[PDB]
């Protein structure tokens, strides 16, 4: 099967955000609201942003996952290459296969999906900061578009999910992701393309 990846703002107002962080050659992460795609070095800090315009319920969580966004390989999990699955990076949460870390929050849980083998990280949905309006969740990508045996050069989108306590779907977003060296340039040419 295949994850949807409808966008849907549920009863809560759901949808991500993302910083205006420029394409500078040293930048590493940066987002394209026209491509609707986040370009980011590899295990580098990224910001995503949750908004909502009402309070959902305790227990609420908010879900990660990648896909490939070519029809023809959507149904392939998308996983670390031979190489880096290997290469005992580990942060002593996440398994060593999965793409897709969440940073810097203990009460992250990784799911290997018993019937479609497919990977995500979940974490509790939590309030935004005193004086702060949204809250931010960084995610970590660990292998680079390109690896061999892996993503193999074929573009992924990552879909966001708020669920409630059962893991039912209360809110979808989502973007392509291009994990590479020098996204700043890598951005700049895709966005000049589109034009
Ligand atoms: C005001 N907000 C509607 C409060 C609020 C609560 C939670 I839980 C998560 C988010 I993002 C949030 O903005
Ligand atoms: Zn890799």
């Not at 050069?153 to 994990?179: A, K, Q, W």
Request: hydrophobic fraction near 30%; charge should be positive.
């Amino acid at each position: 099967s295949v994850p949807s990846q409808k966008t849907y703002q549920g009863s809560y107002g759901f949808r991500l955000g993302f910083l205006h962080s420029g394409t500078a050659k040293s930048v590493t992460c940066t987002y394209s609201p026209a491509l609707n795609k986040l370009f980011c070095q590899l295990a580098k800090t990224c910001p995503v942003q949750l908004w909502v315009d009402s309070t959902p319920p305790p227990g609420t969580r908010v879900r990660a996952m990648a896909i490939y966004k070519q029809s023809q390989h959507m149904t392939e999990v998308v996983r670390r290459c031979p190489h880096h699955e290997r290469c005992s990076d580990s942060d002593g949460l996440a398994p060593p296969q999965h793409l897709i870390r969440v940073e810097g929050n203990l009460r992250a849980e990784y799911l290997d999906d018993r019937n479609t083998f497919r990977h995500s990280v979940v974490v509790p949905c939590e309030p935004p900061e005193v004086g702060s309006d949204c809250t931010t969740i960084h995610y970590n990508y660990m292998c680079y578009s390109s690896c061999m045996g892996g993503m193999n050069r074929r573009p992924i989108l990552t879909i966001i999910t708020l669920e409630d306590s059962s893991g039912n779907l209360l809110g979808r977003d989502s973007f392509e992701v291009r994990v590479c060296a020098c996204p700043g340039r890598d951005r700049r040419t895709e966005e000049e393309n589109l034009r």
